[PDB]
Each structure stands twice: as structure tokens, then as C-alpha cells.
Symmetry: none
Subunit: 274 residues, 4 copies
């Protein structure tokens, strides 16, 4: 918070993609697009751009050279800071390179990307969105204070053979918490971790929820593992389920403030219905 | 100059930004007001303000048509000095409707409550407003000498929360300036601010406030923290601060004292805490 | 001006709003508009049925039946919106007897002053004026005897309609007389603006959570219409602070047509103020 | 709803509930939901049968047919429980032409108010508003003109289905208009709770033993449907006090989709109220 100008050819490494898309910029090189992170049109568009870093984060220094950038941007997990002071000294031979660190799975992401989209000179819309967020959690937290306190929420997604319950310190779970919304006792075992994991045998764990969000991709479709969860026998017995209070939640990860505001939009729609 | 040594008695006042408090304090019912923001007002005050025609948006966009319709005899408001040229133009426009008085203010300290003193005068409520300024000055002297010892020993802090970060208010802004004016000392967590109104910190850096014997956090006019300040208060690392362990963390209403009446309530709150030390 | 500082009419036809004038004057009309029994006490209604009907409830005037009543004076009120229409009619009617129409605007004090003039025309000027001064003295008297109540207490005046209810505004009928008194009334009336009431769905009944006292309109004999009765029967209604506390009351003559009726509103608002 | 996108639409497509509105407006529609004869007069049904069908009796909307009709405006009503589902339909339909859907809660006053809205939009606002006020006046009129009979007489509104029969509750159709009116209705209502109707077998017809008068639903031309007809043949129907006593009557337009219809329900209840 507060109290190489005008770049033409930007390479966007991990967490860079969202910044440039939000900025209206076409990047000259990009990390390998995973389709779950983008609207179908954004995925189709990104697939025409040169792939410069793999989904497993190994960087092609020759691809980046070939793309001839003014500016390389990226987000870095703080625990690998040491590894990346080497990477950016190397990369700086090719162009001015800006990494930013973030810590955890909460506000660190939307703040890290706030930075990056300043650097590419989109600082105004970004800052706009940060302020919008801060005003809306203020607005929503008080307007639905009764609902938020009465209601037990849960936010889930499926993995292979197991389902997760997102914690108070990550993705949409953080945003629910900041909002003053209480969440299932299934959450508590997570501790410092971002989620607590359970077997299909343990689905009853969610029986105290009045509303359940499940994570979906940018097109409101669940991945096959979440889909496998919503198909389990025990899932049909949940008070939240048989009461018809199960909803999708797009952009759960909140990689930016625009995305975090779409999460709030979706929480509010569910709040009105109570 | 603010200390001393167009209609008299105006009937239909339109209170743009910072004019809301002026007319409230003067018991005047305006004919048009800036869109009420609930956190600036008491519960009772906010209901009352909701019965008046909105004439300006929270984002400061002015509805001239609605202002004309309210047929006012006086239009009042405060202007940030960096916008002075933009508002010479807004004044020309509005003056076709009614006599329009704007006052400028610089910064985040005593400027604000003097700009409102000026509006209070313009509005006919000069005597109460000057009384209140006289009172603020007298109490600062009274409290200063009566608690001299505590103010010398106690290191204070004033914090508020943003999304994922918190702020320490500087000595040149809001309640942090009223502490200073009084001669209270404040945590070294202030030091990065410089000329800015606050120093920002990660939840990691909460130890910086270890310094503080007492801590104030900013609330609304009804003593409630906003969610972000509440998120600060909940952190694990917060529970280790010496001021927290000692049970010396308190709400602070009207930290951003817009009027002298307001600044006097901040002094009131600072005095109760001083009595408890 | 309404405030001051055919001589002796024997056979009076009383068109719309004329009825209330002769009743108050003790005069027996020779012809009258169709009596609608919500407007009168039981007794008054019985007496008004034995008078030859001369104007329909939809305000259609029967010139033949008027002539046959042999009037020496035809009186009536006229909404000022229909002023033009009615110089035509007065022209036709004056060929039978002297015809006095009087215009009225709005839903506030307009009415009771127009009947005051009709009362003067008819020969009843003294009682009518007296009631007018009486209304004023009682508003002063009440206003200061229960200043504390009038200061604390938030009133609300409702009537029902089909599927919705109305909160009466400060500028009409019983909500005007409350305002004239200086009583304060629920925020629920704000959306009316310059209109005489604000409408709401039964889901919106908690807007009146505001109120310490609620009046509901009734007919001259203290029975609510079916639509109002509909409203008191709703579920949400029994969760209203005003309803929990037993402060819901009828109000006759809410749309006070004369100063006598306006005084009976005051009378009713006074008996409520004692109880608080 | 009470007072205190083409302006002059040429080509209207009437989805469910629009049919009554354009009929009432004098407007020929350029496409229509599948006509159901029971809802219309014989004349009305012939005319409706010449307009391009655009929606099925099961409310599957044929987007294509709608486009071939090239409408100005697409009107219709929507059950508020399907509000969600229909935000995708409107966004679809609005590719074709400006779409005005109005939500309605329940089977009672909801309907006639939701059609009042639609009647405004196609510019028949005056007549439609006129009926609304005429209804409200008549419910007051009839309620006090026959207060004795409403207090004394137990009513019931019934209709047949396949193998069973129904009693209309106080919150739906003509059962609501009876309630609104102050009429009491047979204990047969009570098993419905919040539902629109109680269903019984032919073995349970004696549950109407307490009714003094019974209305059976008919179509716009006073013929009962066959299921209703079969009800009226059952031994236990034939034994009911009200059936034996002569006091069993048809009731057209029980559904009261519009205020004009609702008023025809009233004329019919009034007619029976006279005879008592």
C-alpha cells in the first residue's frame, strides 16, 4: 500500500499471464497455458503465443532470447528466492527482469500480481481493483452480518481418491474468513496447511455445512475429481446437498484483485438467497 | 488565518463533502447532502442523513440537476488543496444555482478541523465551533500537565488494517497527530513513514510494535473495527505484543477528526486510557 | 381566503361532499349523492337512505331527478383537476336552482376548508368556523401536553389494498393531521416522495419496524376493509415491534372531510398518546 | 404494483400468461403459446387457433418459431421459483427481441398483479388499472352488503382430477378471492397447509359434509371438465348436505389470471350471495 517505461515486448513467466491478460497486452513468450486458469477464449488466444517455460517451471533461456523482449515478468515462491536471484542474473543478460515474491496461498498472490501489473504500466486498473475489493468486503461483511454468522460454509475440491476442504488461510477460504463467515469443523484439522484432506468414507465430515462451494475452472465446470466427489453416495445425504445449497465457485485461487472480486460477487449471490 | 481576537442565518444549505459534519454539529437540516457513508456517523445520525436528498456521490461526482432542484440559499464543502484548480470551475458552475463556499485543506492534521471551523462560521454556527476549538486547546493543556508522568513513560501506537497488511499512523495524520500535539510519544514503528501518513507492514513484521505500551486501533463511529483491522487483531503474532499481554489495546473513534468536536472525543478517549495507567 | 377576522335555503340538493355539510348543519336535504356506508355511522347511513338519490357513486348527475326535488340551492365539492368540466355542469344545473361549487387541491387541509365554505353557503357558517378554531386550539393543546410523547414516539398510518399495503405520507389524510400535530412518522413513508402514500409487498412489512405506534384505517364504525384486515393477518406483521407491544389501533375518518371529522382524528390520536 | 422496450409495440409474442393480456388489450399477437380451450371463450379459442404456435403446453419454448414470427416484443410470466432458469432464457430470447418477463409468487393475488404489469407494457395500462380499482371497490362493497351471509355460510371450491378430487385452499384461485372476501370455507381446506389444494379420494368426499354451498370449477362456458363431472356422480357427493339441498354452483374463471377475470369470479359469488 502507498501513502523500462512503456514496454513493448513482454515475456510472462509463471503468474505473469494473468497480469498481461488483465492489461490488454499481448505477450511475446509465455508459460505453458493450463486451460483451467482461463476463459476458453483466453486459452485459445494464449495457445498461439510462444511457449517459453514448461508447466513444471523449467525455463527455456533460448526461447526467451529468440522472443527478444524489453521485459521479463514473473512471480516467485518466497522459499525459492535464493534459486531465482541466480535465474534473474542469468536472464538479465537478455532483458530487464522483474520477479516478485509472495508467501502462502492468501493475499500474497493478489498483492504480488498487483506489483507486476504496476511494472507493466497497468498500475491504475490494478490499484482500482484493490480498492474495490477492500470496499466490498466492508460492504458485504456488514450488510449480511446476520447471514454470515448464522451460516456454516464449506469450500471443497476433489483430488484423486480424496477431497479437500480449503482452510482459512488460502484461496476462497481466506476470502470467506476475512468476510467473517464461519466454516465447517472439517476445516480445523488443516492447521497451517491450505486444506484438510479426507476419504470418500469421511464425506459426513461436511454434515454441519449449510452451504457448500465447490471449486471450478474459469468456465464454471468442475474438474473430473471434483465431479467424482459430487457423484459419491454419501454426498447425497448432506444437509447442505439435499437442501439444494451446493454452488460452484469460479476463480477460487484469486491470483489477482479482479479475480478476488469475482469470488466476492459469487459469495454475495449466495448470501442474498439466504 | 483561522483564529480570531453570504446569507446571515442560511435556510436551505447543500452540504457537499465535509459539510455533513458542519450542519450536524449546528443542528441544521440540509436540503441536499453528499451520500452518507455509515462509518463516519452514529447510528442515529445515519438514519437522519438518509432522509435527505443525495446530491453528490461517495466518489465525489456532483449532481448539478439535483442541487438546483433543492433550491438552496448556500452550498458548502471542503476541498483537498491538490484539487484547488479543478474546484475553481466547480464553484463557477454551482454559483449559478446559489452562493457557493468551498474551503481548502492541506494534509491530514489540524488542517481538517480548521477548514470545518471555517464552514461552521459561514453557516452561522461560529460561536459553538470556536468554543470547541477553545476547548480542544484548553484540554490539551489540562491533560498534558495532569498526566505528564504517564505521557513521559508510555509509548503509544495507533494502527489500522488493510488487506493482508497493517498501517501505523504517523505523527502528521489523524489520531497519530492528536497524540503528538498532546505530547504523547509513539512507537518507532512510525519511522518509515517520513512525510507519509502511515508506515505499512506485513503480518510478519508485527513485532515492530513491540515498542508499544498502549495500542489504539481505528474503529467507526460506533466502536466497530472494519474486517481488515479485525483480521490484524486475530493474528497469532499479535498475541505476543507486550501491549496485548497487558490488556492495553483499545478502540479509537474519530481518529480522523474532521471537526474540533471530533478531536475532543479523541482526547476524551485518550484520557480514559491515561487514567488507567 | 378561508379564515375570517340565497339567504335562508329550505331545500338543498347535496352532490359530492355536500352530504357531510348538511348532516353537520342538522339540515334535511331534498336530494343527495349515493350514500356509501363506509363514510357514515350506522344511524347517519339509515337517515341518508330515505333521501332521493340524485348523483351516482361514480359521480354521474341526474338532472331530471334534481329538478323534481325542487331545490333552491345545489351544493358540492369539485377536485380542482376537474374544474373545467364543472363550469359546464354548473351552467346546466343553474337553470334549476342556484348552484355553488367549490374546488379543492391535494389531500391535506384543502378539503376541510372547502367544506367550511360549503358550510358557510348553507347557513352553518358559525358552527363550521367554530370547529375550525377548535381544531386549531386542540392541535396547540395536545402538542404541548404530550410534547415528550410526540418527541419520542414514531407513528405510522397504514391501509391495505389487494396484495400490497400502503404507508400514508406526511402530506395526506391522517398522515397530514399527524404531521400538522408535529408527531414523527416512520421512515417507511420516504419512498412516497410527493405522492400520498408508499406501497409495499407483504415481504416488505419489516419496513415498519421503525414504528412505536401503528394506526390502521377503518370505516366510520371502526371496521377495517377486507384488504386492511388482510394485512393484519400476515405472518410478518406479528413480528413488528409495534405489534409485539400491543400498540396497533384503529383510526376513523383518516381522510377527514370536515373540521369536525379532523377533530375526531385528534381525539383518537390523543387517547393513544395518554397510554404511552 | 400500485401507482399514486417499444413504446407502441406492433408485433407481440405471447408466452404463458401473455395470451390473456393481448386478448384483453384488443391486440393480435404474432405468435402465441399453445392455446388451451378451457382458458378462453369459444370465440377466443377460434381466433387463438390461427396464430403461430411458439410454446408447447409443457412450456418448452421453441426459439426458432419465435424468430420466424419476428416480434417487436416478447411478453410473459414466470413462476418466481424458476427465476434462475429464466435468466438464461431471457438472455437467449433477447437476441430476438426485447423481452419482458414478470415474476409471480403463488396462485393468489400474484397472478392478477403480474398481468396488470404486462398489460401496462403493451400499453393497455388504463383499462387494466381501471379493473384493479373496480375489484378493490367491489370486494369492499360485497363484503359489507352481505356480511351476514358471509358469516353464516360455509363455502367450498372443488375440482376433479383423474381418480381423485381437490378442494381449493384460501391462498389460491377462487379460494383466495373467497378468503379475501371474508367468507369461511369448509374444514376440507385444512390438510393443504401451505399447499394450493387438498386432494382426496372418492372415499373422502364426506369431508365436505360441513359445507352449506359448493362451487365446482368450470371452463369459460360453464361446462365442467370430465374429471369434475365424474366427481359430481359419486355416491358420496350425492349425499352431501349442500348437494341434496340444491346449493351447488358452477364458477367460471376460478384461476383469476387477470383483474377482469377476478371480477367475474366476484359477480358469480355475489349472485349466490343474493339468493341466500
Amino acid at each position: 500500500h502507498h501513502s523500462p517505461a512503456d514496454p513493448q515486448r513482454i515475456v510472462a513467466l509463471e503468474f505473469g499471464t494473468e497480469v498481461v491478460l488483465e492489461a490488454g497486452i499481448e505477450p511475446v513468450g509465455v508459460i505453458e497455458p493450463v486451460a483451467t486458469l482461463y476463459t476458453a477464449e483466453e486459452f485459445e488466444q494464449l495457445s498461439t503465443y510462444p511457449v517459453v517455460q514448461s508447466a513444471s517451471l523449467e525455463i527455456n533461456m533460448e526461447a526467451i532470447a529468440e522472443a527478444q523482449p524489453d521485459l521479463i515478468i514473473g512471480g516467485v515462491r518466497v522459499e525459492s528466492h535464493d534459486e531465482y536471484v541466480g535465474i534473474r542474473e542469468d536472464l538479465e543478460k537478455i532483458a530487464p527482469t522483474v520477479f516478485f515474491d509472495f508467501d502462502g496461498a492468501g493475499s500474497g498472490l493478489r498483492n504480488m500480481t498487483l506489483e507486476l501489473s504496476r511494472v507493466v504500466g497497468d498500475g491504475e486498473r490494478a490499484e482500482a481493483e484493490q480498492q474495490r475489493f477492500e470496499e466490498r468486503v466492508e460492504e458485504i461483511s456488514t450488510a449480511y452480518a446476520d447471514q454470515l454468522a448464522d451460516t456454516t460454509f464449506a469450500l471443497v475440491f476433489g483430488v484423486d481418491g480424496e477431497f479437500a476442504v480449503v482452510n482459512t488461510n488460502a484461496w476462497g477460504g481466506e476470502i470467506l474468513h476475512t468476510l467473517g463467515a464461519k466454516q465447517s469443523k472439517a476445516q480445523q484439522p488443516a492447521g497451517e496447511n491450505f486444506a484438510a484432506f479426507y476419504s470418500y468414507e469421511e464425506i459426513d465430515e461436511l454434515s454441519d455445512a449449510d452451504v457448500i462451494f465447490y471449486e471450478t475452472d474459469a468456465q464454471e465446470n468442475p474438474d473430473p475429481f471434483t465431479e467424482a466427489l459430487l457423484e459419491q453416495k454419501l454426498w447425497q445425504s448432506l444437509p447442505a446437498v439435499e437442501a439444494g445449497q451446493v454452488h460452484p465457485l469460479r476463480y477460487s485461487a484469486a491470483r489477482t484483485y479482479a479475480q478476488a472480486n469475482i469470488v466476492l460477487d459469487q459469495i454475495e449471490e449466495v448470501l442474498k438467497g439466504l
